[PDB]
Enzyme design. Sequence first.
Site, PDB file in Angstrom:
ATOM      1  N   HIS A  44       0.821  -1.277   0.093  1.00  0.00           N
ATOM      2  CA  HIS A  44      -0.032  -0.067   0.052  1.00  0.00           C
ATOM      3  C   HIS A  44       0.721   1.374  -0.064  1.00  0.00           C
ATOM      4  O   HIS A  44       0.444   2.318  -0.431  1.00  0.00           O
ATOM      5  CB  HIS A  44      -0.915   0.011   1.218  1.00  0.00           C
ATOM      6  CG  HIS A  44      -0.539   0.308   2.503  1.00  0.00           C
ATOM      7  ND1 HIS A  44      -0.333  -0.590   3.482  1.00  0.00           N
ATOM      8  CD2 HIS A  44      -0.309   1.326   2.988  1.00  0.00           C
ATOM      9  CE1 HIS A  44       0.226  -0.086   4.455  1.00  0.00           C
ATOM     10  NE2 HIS A  44       0.151   1.292   4.248  1.00  0.00           N
ATOM     11  N   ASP A  93      -1.077  -7.487   1.925  1.00  0.00           N
ATOM     12  CA  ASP A  93      -0.222  -6.140   1.901  1.00  0.00           C
ATOM     13  C   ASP A  93       1.230  -6.395   2.209  1.00  0.00           C
ATOM     14  O   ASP A  93       1.931  -6.269   3.173  1.00  0.00           O
ATOM     15  CB  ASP A  93      -0.732  -5.314   2.927  1.00  0.00           C
ATOM     16  CG  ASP A  93      -0.281  -4.041   2.897  1.00  0.00           C
ATOM     17  OD1 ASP A  93       0.273  -3.540   2.062  1.00  0.00           O
ATOM     18  OD2 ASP A  93      -0.787  -3.244   3.879  1.00  0.00           O
ATOM     19  N   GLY A 186       2.166   6.101   8.787  1.00  0.00           N
ATOM     20  CA  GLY A 186       3.821   6.438   8.636  1.00  0.00           C
ATOM     21  C   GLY A 186       4.749   5.483   9.093  1.00  0.00           C
ATOM     22  O   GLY A 186       5.903   5.084   8.587  1.00  0.00           O
ATOM     23  N   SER A 188       3.705   2.206   8.534  1.00  0.00           N
ATOM     24  CA  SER A 188       3.477   1.424   7.310  1.00  0.00           C
ATOM     25  C   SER A 188       4.624   0.973   6.722  1.00  0.00           C
ATOM     26  O   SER A 188       5.654   1.421   6.286  1.00  0.00           O
ATOM     27  CB  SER A 188       2.548   2.306   5.968  1.00  0.00           C
ATOM     28  OG  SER A 188       1.376   2.367   6.701  1.00  0.00           O
ATOM     29  N   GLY A 189       4.726  -0.479   6.321  1.00  0.00           N
ATOM     30  CA  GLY A 189       5.720  -0.983   5.786  1.00  0.00           C
ATOM     31  C   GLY A 189       7.097  -1.526   6.565  1.00  0.00           C
ATOM     32  O   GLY A 189       7.843  -2.394   6.261  1.00  0.00           O
TER      33      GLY A 189
HETATM   34  C1  LIG Z   1     -10.399   2.539   7.575  1.00  0.00           C
HETATM   35  C2  LIG Z   1      -9.422   1.663   8.565  1.00  0.00           C
HETATM   36  C3  LIG Z   1     -10.029   0.499   9.059  1.00  0.00           C
HETATM   37  C4  LIG Z   1      -7.888   1.499   8.114  1.00  0.00           C
HETATM   38  C5  LIG Z   1      -7.191   2.778   7.928  1.00  0.00           C
HETATM   39  N1  LIG Z   1      -7.091   3.545   8.985  1.00  0.00           N
HETATM   40  C6  LIG Z   1      -6.061   4.483   9.154  1.00  0.00           C
HETATM   41  C7  LIG Z   1      -5.819   5.047  10.798  1.00  0.00           C
HETATM   42  C8  LIG Z   1      -4.952   6.448  10.941  1.00  0.00           C
HETATM   43  C9  LIG Z   1      -5.309   7.504   9.968  1.00  0.00           C
HETATM   44  C10 LIG Z   1      -5.212   6.879   8.538  1.00  0.00           C
HETATM   45  C11 LIG Z   1      -6.105   5.961   8.420  1.00  0.00           C
HETATM   46  C12 LIG Z   1      -5.745   2.439   7.509  1.00  0.00           C
HETATM   47  O1  LIG Z   1      -5.135   1.624   8.491  1.00  0.00           O
HETATM   48  N2  LIG Z   1      -5.005   2.611   6.351  1.00  0.00           N
HETATM   49  C13 LIG Z   1      -5.583   3.095   5.201  1.00  0.00           C
HETATM   50  C14 LIG Z   1      -4.870   2.738   4.031  1.00  0.00           C
HETATM   51  F1  LIG Z   1      -5.243   1.498   3.648  1.00  0.00           F
HETATM   52  F2  LIG Z   1      -4.703   3.624   2.905  1.00  0.00           F
HETATM   53  C15 LIG Z   1      -3.281   2.682   4.579  1.00  0.00           C
HETATM   54  C16 LIG Z   1      -3.778   2.040   5.987  1.00  0.00           C
HETATM   55  C17 LIG Z   1      -2.807   2.924   7.073  1.00  0.00           C
HETATM   56  O2  LIG Z   1      -3.136   4.090   7.394  1.00  0.00           O
HETATM   57  N3  LIG Z   1      -1.846   2.170   7.599  1.00  0.00           N
HETATM   58  C18 LIG Z   1      -0.920   2.415   8.562  1.00  0.00           C
HETATM   59  C19 LIG Z   1      -1.367   2.165  10.036  1.00  0.00           C
HETATM   60  C20 LIG Z   1      -2.495   2.693  10.528  1.00  0.00           C
HETATM   61  C21 LIG Z   1      -2.888   2.306  11.838  1.00  0.00           C
HETATM   62  C22 LIG Z   1      -2.339   1.184  12.514  1.00  0.00           C
HETATM   63  C23 LIG Z   1      -2.933   0.786  13.688  1.00  0.00           C
HETATM   64  N4  LIG Z   1      -3.597   1.413  14.531  1.00  0.00           N
HETATM   65  N5  LIG Z   1      -2.066  -0.077  14.520  1.00  0.00           N
HETATM   66  C24 LIG Z   1      -1.202  -1.116  13.837  1.00  0.00           C
HETATM   67  C25 LIG Z   1      -0.669  -0.583  12.365  1.00  0.00           C
HETATM   68  C26 LIG Z   1      -1.210   0.600  11.896  1.00  0.00           C
HETATM   69  C27 LIG Z   1      -0.787   0.923  10.411  1.00  0.00           C
END
Ligand SMILES: CC(C)C[C@@H](NC1CCCCC1)C(=O)N1CC(F)(F)C[C@H]1C(=O)NCc1ccc2c(N)nccc2c1
Length: 236
Positions: A44, A93, A186, A188-189
């Site tokens: 992602h 992912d 941030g 991520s990865g």
């Molecule tokens: C719609 C939601 C179900 C998912 C959604 N929620 C985030 C929360 C923070 C602000 C941005 C959106 C989500 O994660 N992502 C959206 C996406 F798919 F585009 C990429 C992914 C993301 O933001 N990855 C990073 C992340 C975020 C929260 C985490 C975490 N809380 N724990 C471990 C790991 C975590 C890792």
Amino acid sequence: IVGGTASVRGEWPWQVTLHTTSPTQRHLCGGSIIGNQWILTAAHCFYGVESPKILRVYSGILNQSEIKEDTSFFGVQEIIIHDQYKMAESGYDIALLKLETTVNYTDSQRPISLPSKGDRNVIYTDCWVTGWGYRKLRDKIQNTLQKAKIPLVTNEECQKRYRGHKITHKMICAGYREGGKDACKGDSGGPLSCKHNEVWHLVGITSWGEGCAQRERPGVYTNVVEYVDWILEKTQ
Ligand SMILES: CC(C)C[C@@H](NC1CCCCC1)C(=O)N1CC(F)(F)C[C@H]1C(=O)NCc1ccc2c(N)nccc2c1
């Protein structure tokens, strides 16, 4: 990282910072060194990435502020994204970056071992998440590489917390019931790193979660063990 603390130099030598330079230079995601020419990260991360040309991989970094115009980086030859990948939350992912040169391993750049053959049923009790992500929702990228210890939770429990998602055996979850400590935007990865018999293993890749450090909402990670055959296929 939410609820984390600063790392010290050399502490997590497989951690990389992956930068984009389009339209301007900034940290895009974490990754892990798994081979001399190979970084494991999240699919992602590549959503708005036009090509490998604009990427830069930095190893040995503690503070983002250390990276200057003369700081050496590794170019990315190829981004290999899993063929079934569609979106973070639906699984798969996982990406490999093939670097343009082979890392000479040093104290500050070291590989992390994949989960080992024979260790499929091992229970990991010393897991850590690292990165330069947000410490809260609506934050910024942090300067100093942050670390937080987080317990794994069972897939059964994780599914009960995410009844709107399909949690599968190719995912692994980690979090405290009360929140407080978690990975975030941030991170991520980057790695979910677990120490077994004093050897570190890349057990998870930071993928997604609902909010960050929200109670009863664990982090969801790519379950690396289930992709070891895919990694080995692409890296041989
Ligand atoms: C719609 C939601 C179900 C998912 C959604 N929620 C985030 C929360 C923070 C602000 C941005 C959106 C989500 O994660 N992502 C959206 C996406 F798919 F585009 C990429 C992914 C993301 O933001 N990855 C990073 C992340 C975020 C929260 C985490 C975490 N809380 N724990 C471990 C790991 C975590 C890792």
